[PDB]
Amino acid sequence: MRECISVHVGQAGVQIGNSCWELYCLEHGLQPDGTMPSDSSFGTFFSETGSGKHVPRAVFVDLEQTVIGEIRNGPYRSLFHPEQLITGKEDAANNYARGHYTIGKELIDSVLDRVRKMADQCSGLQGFLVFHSFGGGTGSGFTSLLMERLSVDYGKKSKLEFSVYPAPRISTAVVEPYNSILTTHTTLEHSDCAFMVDNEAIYDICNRNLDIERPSYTNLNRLIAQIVSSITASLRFDGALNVDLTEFQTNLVPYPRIHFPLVTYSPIISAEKAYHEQLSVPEITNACFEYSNQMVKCDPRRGKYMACCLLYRGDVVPKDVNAAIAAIKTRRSIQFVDWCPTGFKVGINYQPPTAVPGGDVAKVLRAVCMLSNTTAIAEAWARLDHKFDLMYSKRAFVHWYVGEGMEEGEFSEAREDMAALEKDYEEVGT
Amino acid sequence: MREIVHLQAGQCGNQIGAKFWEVISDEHGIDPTGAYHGDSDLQLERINVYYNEATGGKYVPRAVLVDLEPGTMDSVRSGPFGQIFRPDNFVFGQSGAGNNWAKGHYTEGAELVDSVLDVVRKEAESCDCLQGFQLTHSLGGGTGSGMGTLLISKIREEYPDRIMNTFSVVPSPKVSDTVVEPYNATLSVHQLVENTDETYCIDNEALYDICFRTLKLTTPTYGDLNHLVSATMSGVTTCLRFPGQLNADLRKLAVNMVPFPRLHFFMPGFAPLTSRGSQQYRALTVPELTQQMFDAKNMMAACDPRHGRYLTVAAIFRGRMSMKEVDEQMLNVQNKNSSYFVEWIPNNVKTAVCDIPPRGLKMSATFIGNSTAIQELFKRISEQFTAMFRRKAFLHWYTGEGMDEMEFTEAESNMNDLVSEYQQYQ
Amino acid sequence: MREIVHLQAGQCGNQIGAKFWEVISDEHGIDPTGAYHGDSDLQLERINVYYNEATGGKYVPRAVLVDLEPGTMDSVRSGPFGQIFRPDNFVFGQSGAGNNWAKGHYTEGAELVDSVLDVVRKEAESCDCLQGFQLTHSLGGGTGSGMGTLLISKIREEYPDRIMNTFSVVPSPKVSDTVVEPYNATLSVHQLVENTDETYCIDNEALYDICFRTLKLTTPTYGDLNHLVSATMSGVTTCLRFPGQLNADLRKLAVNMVPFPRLHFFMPGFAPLTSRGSQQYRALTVPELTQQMFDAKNMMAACDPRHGRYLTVAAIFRGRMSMKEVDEQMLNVQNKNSSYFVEWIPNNVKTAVCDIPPRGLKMSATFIGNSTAIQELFKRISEQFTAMFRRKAFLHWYTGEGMDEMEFTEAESNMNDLVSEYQQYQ
Ligand SMILES: CC(=O)O[C@H]1C(=O)[C@@]2(C)[C@H]([C@H](OC(=O)c3ccccc3)[C@]3(O)C[C@H](OC(=O)[C@H](O)[C@@H](NC(=O)c4ccccc4)c4ccccc4)C(C)=C1C3(C)C)[C@]1(OC(C)=O)CO[C@@H]1C[C@@H]2O
Numbered sequence A: 001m002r003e004c005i006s007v008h009v010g011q012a013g014v015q016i017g018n019s020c021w022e023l024y025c026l027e028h029g030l031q032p033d034g035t036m037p038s039d040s041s042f043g044t045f046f047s048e049t050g051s052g053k054h055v056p057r058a059v060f061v062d063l064e065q066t067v068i069g070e071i072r073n074g075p076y077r078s079l080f081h082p083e084q085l086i087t088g089k090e091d092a093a094n095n096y097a098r099g100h101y102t103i104g105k106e107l108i109d110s111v112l113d114r115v116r117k118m119a120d121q122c123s124g125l126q127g128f129l130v131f132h133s134f135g136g137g138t139g140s141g142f143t144s145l146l147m148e149r150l151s152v153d154y155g156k157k158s159k160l161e162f163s164v165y166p167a168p169r170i171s172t173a174v175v176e177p178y179n180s181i182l183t184t185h186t187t188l189e190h191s192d193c194a195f196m197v198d199n200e201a202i203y204d205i206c207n208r209n210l211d212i213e214r215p216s217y218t219n220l221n222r223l224i225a226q227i228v229s230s231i232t233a234s235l236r237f238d239g240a241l242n243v244d245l246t247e248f249q250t251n252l253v254p255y256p257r258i259h260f261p262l263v264t265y266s267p268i269i270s271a272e273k274a275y276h277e278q279l280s281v282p283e284i285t286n287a288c289f290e291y292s293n294q295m296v297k298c299d300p301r302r303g304k305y306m307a308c309c310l311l312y313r314g315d316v317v318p319k320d321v322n323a324a325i326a327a328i329k330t331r332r333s334i335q336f337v338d339w340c341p342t343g344f345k346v347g348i349n350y351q352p353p354t355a356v357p358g359g360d361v362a363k364v365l366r367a368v369c370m371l372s373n374t375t376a377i378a379e380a381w382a383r384l385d386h387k388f389d390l391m392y393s394k395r396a397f398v399h400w401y402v403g404e405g406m407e408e409g410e411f412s413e414a415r416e417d418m419a420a421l422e423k424d425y426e427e428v429g430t
Numbered sequence B, C: 001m002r003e004i005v006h007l008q009a010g011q012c013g014n015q016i017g018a019k020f021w022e023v024i025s026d027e028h029g030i031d032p033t034g035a036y037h038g039d040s041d042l043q044l045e046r047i048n049v050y051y052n053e054a055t056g057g058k059y060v061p062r063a064v065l066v067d068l069e070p071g072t073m074d075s076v077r078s079g080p081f082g083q084i085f086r087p088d089n090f091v092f093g094q095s096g097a098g099n100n101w102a103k104g105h106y107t108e109g110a111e112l113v114d115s116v117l118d119v120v121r122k123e124a125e126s127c128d129c130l131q132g133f134q135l136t137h138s139l140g141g142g143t144g145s146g147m148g149t150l151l152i153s154k155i156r157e158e159y160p161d162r163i164m165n166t167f168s169v170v171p172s173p174k175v176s177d178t179v180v181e182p183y184n185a186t187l188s189v190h191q192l193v194e195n196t197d198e199t200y201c202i203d204n205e206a207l208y209d210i211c212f213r214t215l216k217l218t219t220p221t222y223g224d225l226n227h228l229v230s231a232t233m234s235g236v237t238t239c240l241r242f243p244g245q246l247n248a249d250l251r252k253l254a255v256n257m258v259p260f261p262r263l264h265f266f267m268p269g270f271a272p273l274t275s276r277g278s279q280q281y282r283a284l285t286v287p288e289l290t291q292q293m294f295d296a297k298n299m300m301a302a303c304d305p306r307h308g309r310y311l312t313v314a315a316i317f318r319g320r321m322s323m324k325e326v327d328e329q330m331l332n333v334q335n336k337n338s339s340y341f342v343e344w345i346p347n348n349v350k351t352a353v354c355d356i357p358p359r360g361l362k363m364s365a366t367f368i369g370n371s372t373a374i375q376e377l378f379k380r381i382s383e384q385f386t387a388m389f390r391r392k393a394f395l396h397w398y399t400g401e402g403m404d405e406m407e408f409t410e411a412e413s414n415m416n417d418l419v420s421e422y423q424q425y426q
């Protein structure tokens, strides 16, 4: 009852996974060898074997060995089942077509066999949590190969998807716009709620709120995992107003294709400041509406809100939350659509946010994760399809994709389908 | 002897229900084990109204507990009184309602209702003379709104002459936790107007207004809201559980309270309510119970009665009190406030008087309003529904369960027909 | 039953007020908690005159507390009796009056008066029969002088027939703490002459003269001055709080005390006052109370009555005493001092006699003088005002609040018109 299968794809998805499973082990009190010293709260994320060993409901997939061989050697080598850490011989080379058509074509029927052996251990599986990069070759091409299979094999089950998405200025690859636009069919047709996240927005959150001047990816992944702990907390714990994984979607998603919420977390705070701020429910609610805390570089004030899920956790009371959202409804800069007069879905859970002991993010009595469907996110798509247009007007890297079995027309068919999504988010604001 | 069958649906219905069972077990002097430990013979005389006798003089409450998720059953079963209920009467699914009415009514609860209804039969066949069904639910979300109204339809078809009596927590704009709340409620009110004999309309905005502007609680929880609801649930059945100077069965309420068949959307209240630090300064007596009971801040729905007129009010008093003083105050109210009562009914107030006040107070009054001001509760849901529905927003989650767009059009049509019938007698 | 509403403005008005509430709570036998702890039924019989009954027989005083700064509310709320007052009745700003009348009347208090006046309504609507308003303030500085006279204007317009009765601490040259004191007072006296029914003119120079030349205190504080003021505040209302041989309401004082409408600037006093080390040698009796009460050293304004004539005096006695002896002494005074009373009034003394003397003395007398000698208090303020105003000194602080120079000219014009009407009957 209430299981989730977490699939971690490419380097970004696996490294976010290595932070997710670092957190879930602390939060459920599971040792890094999978044992538990001394309630079924762990059952959403861990299968339990008769030895008293808790084994994660996770699959890790990469087309090259390097990142998963590090998971197979570091402190979590004894946590995972050895055949659900899955590797190929050959890197996807930041090429969608190697991930989808040529290299991932070989590992896919082994990836599915592990997901089948995990689902057969569930009893009322709640959904899938799929972690990936939009810019990667494995991230875009292998996730889009896998999702097409899971959407015929498990058609009813909710597919939640956490995506590291290209930034306004920060980029690691020349072909990041091509891989991202080719992914837009995956999220539109074979996903149920897709959480876009941006490296440059978290880098700015780190600078302004944690006061860390120069963060690594370990600092980003420790924020991205904290949001998924808070999405899953109602599945795992007692609360005043627990939220089911489909109850979440029935309030987030107004229309079948309008399932790209923003996400934000509050308070992001260091130990230098957490002892001087009040961190009252009013303040951490208001922090979620600041452009300063959005984890995609777009401004919510250039949009309208369709719906917000305020998922509180720790020491909060429904009195305080209603009194808080009443001030948000009073502020004329936070504008909802005319057709959503209710606006807010509230969840409240009694389990505080767990600190990772090595981390920058401080101990606090309260947190909220706000997950928010808003028209503003269409600007993060308008940025990236303008990067695509400059390169496709030259066919600037297209021979690497055509050379690995892709149809040249798929680039036009993907830029077309993105323009129809960017149309849909502009159309519903009116 | 006038047994009631009680049914709990979804998170809210099981939470206001699991608090109600702590309140009436305190009244009837029943231990959390189910053993009787009370003071008085009057506590035991009518214990059959809400409980079954079992071996060793253990009492088992006649609740059915319904949910589409295990987690609220787990929260009730582990709770303050959870061990009291029959293990067979916890009827549940595994995958929830997703806050979707159509999952409740057509898919997830349509599977489960065959397993619910056959337990409602075992309890109703164990009754000596069943008077009715007492169902606790919410009209927001999907389990209480959509499965609870499926279950009302099934029990109504099977028991057409018994009282169907529902306690219905329902949406309002300033205290909301769901995006699709307006849809679920509009689909659900369409079932309540046809099937129930009484529906007690309750609102979280009004239950928070009692907690801040009367009780002066700094941080009211859902546990504090559930305590206000369950006081009025204990209140209206009092006259079949205890002796009195004027006895009123749930049917003796309905005959006096419902002038035209569909105008049965009531609005409850309770007195005395006092700020916790102020009780020693207050005189508990019938004219102070009256000046609280008939004031717009005390009622448990957002409707100010000064925006309509009452059709009927019932005041079910409890305690040792004068019939002259009760009959004097229920006259003085409707003559001094005559602009707030309909003038084609020659007396708008029903009274009842029980000899046994709640444990720890000398007197109490449960108030039931029927008023044309309840149009405002149905209007604001209907206008939130309309503003989403003109752009078909969120409908793929309901039409995915095989529901028609025509059923939304027909639900909002039947909602405006209920608004029009209250506005007609304004 | 002849309720009073009491209002405190600025530092001085809240300090003479917060001492007054300690004095009348001792009289009525009310504990600092608000609970009744007195000896006698007579203490409870008229407790409604200054208090509201609340739950548990706690009494809540009918004060409104007004300031433009939080710091005096903080000093009252934390004080000897601070917990007695209603939290809602503390009405305050954040940035002060700057000792500026125009900040009080036009800017800082014009914002706040909408929040004051709507509390004065809640207290006046809770009254059974309101007799009047009892406002404590100072005419120096900016809060009491400028906001308090704004508030007098607003309450006068809303309650035109109720008694407006003010206790007004006001400037004098030898005991001063403000440079702009003359301006603030001249702008404020212009409102008092038109709106109030009685104004009791009080002076810190005269309150220090009582402390040194009568009580022989070595170091008199503002707490000792506030105790002299509040004894005469308790004094003049005594006859609506306690029984007596001659009862006099605040209106029965006004009809006898105010010959021509504007001549209502009274000058209070109290007896017996004795040096603390000397009480055992003094005989408390009506002719000694008289020989103190009618002597120039006892009155609480700097005016020596030997510089004018009285129009009317009221002597409100308290205690078990002979009406022959009272009527004998109030005759003997105005025949042996006939050059100090106006000879177109055939008897200048009103008497009243209450049966209940203050706690710890066998008799007491509160004195109210109306005398043409009050011209000297208005004259010396008018000449200090004139000597600054001929050179426009400090006016940018008032004209910066949008006040005209014409309003200063018109205030000092109305001040000399008040001086001329007292000097006319000399
Ligand atoms: C010494 C004293 O005066 O105690 C009172 C008390 O102080 C006050 C404030 C009580 C108190 O009520 C609350 O604190 C409260 C808080 C949130 C929501 C609702 C109530 C009291 O707890 C509640 C309690 O009432 C009862 O026990 C009733 O029988 C009630 N049942 C329960 O509350 C209950 C509690 C725990 C377990 C099972 C039942 C009831 C009401 C209707 C029908 C049947 C039973 C009483 C008299 C008091 C306290 C104890 C302070 C009040 O409640 C009642 C029902 O009387 C709140 O306003 C009234 C006025 C009372 O004076």
Ligand SMILES: CC(=O)O[C@H]1C(=O)[C@@]2(C)[C@H]([C@H](OC(=O)c3ccccc3)[C@]3(O)C[C@H](OC(=O)[C@H](O)[C@@H](NC(=O)c4ccccc4)c4ccccc4)C(C)=C1C3(C)C)[C@]1(OC(C)=O)CO[C@@H]1C[C@@H]2O
Pocket: C022, C023, C026, C027, C215, C224, C225, C227, C228, C230, C231, C232, C234, C235, C272, C273, C274, C275, C276, C279, C358, C359, C360, C361
């Ligand atoms: C044994 C004895 O004779 O005690 C007297 C006393 O010695 C004298 C000196 C008292 C005393 O007065 C003062 O010390 C004092 C100091 C500064 C300013 C004003 C007074 C006394 O404190 C004051 C007190 O008076 C009262 O209590 C009145 O009821 C008074 N209320 C208060 O003073 C009071 C004090 C604390 C808390 C609440 C009230 C009052 C006056 C008018 C209307 C109502 C009440 C009394 C009789 C005395 C002492 C105790 C020494 C005198 O006051 C009164 C009001 O009687 C000062 O001259 C009189 C003559 C008294 O003989």
Ligand SMILES: Nc1nc2c(ncn2[C@@H]2O[C@H](COP(=O)(O)OP(=O)(O)OP(=O)(O)O)[C@@H](O)[C@H]2O)c(=O)[nH]1
Pocket: A009, A010, A011, A012, A015, A016, A063, A091, A092, A093, A094, A095, A133, A134, A135, A136, A137, A138, A139, A140, A164, A166, A171, A172, A173, A199, A217, A218, A220, A221
């Ligand atoms: N936050 C975060 N971002 C990461 C991390 N690792 C990689 N990224 C992002 O990943 C994006 C590019 O995708 P890749 O890392 O090349 O994805 P991949 O699936 O491994 O691609 P292939 O090597 O072609 O298979 C860049 O925009 C990076 O910023 C990580 O651990 N944390």
Ligand SMILES: Nc1nc2c(ncn2[C@@H]2O[C@H](COP(=O)(O)OP(=O)(O)O)[C@@H](O)[C@H]2O)c(=O)[nH]1
Pocket: A240, A241, B009, B010, B011, B012, B013, B015, B016, B097, B099, B138, B140, B141, B142, B143, B144, B145, B169, B176, B177, B178, B204, B222, B223, B225, B226
């Ligand atoms: N009074 C009360 N209201 C509740 C409680 N739990 C939830 N609610 C509120 O009322 C609504 C109930 O919907 P819910 O019961 O969650 O839907 P369901 O489980 O699908 O039937 C929520 O949106 C909350 O605002 C509770 O314990 N008490």
Ligand SMILES: Nc1nc2c(ncn2[C@@H]2O[C@H](COP(=O)(O)OP(=O)(O)O)[C@@H](O)[C@H]2O)c(=O)[nH]1
Pocket: C009, C010, C011, C012, C013, C015, C016, C097, C099, C138, C140, C141, C142, C143, C144, C145, C169, C176, C177, C178, C204, C222, C223, C225, C226
């Ligand atoms: N009797 C008395 N006089 C005071 C007290 N406090 C201040 N005063 C005096 O009278 C004047 C009052 O002005 P104030 O109340 O300070 O002005 P405001 O606060 O702006 O109204 C001061 O200049 C002091 O001389 C007090 O507690 N008692």
Ligand SMILES: [Mg+2]
Pocket: A010, A011, A092, A136, A137, A138, A139
């Ligand atoms: Mg890779």
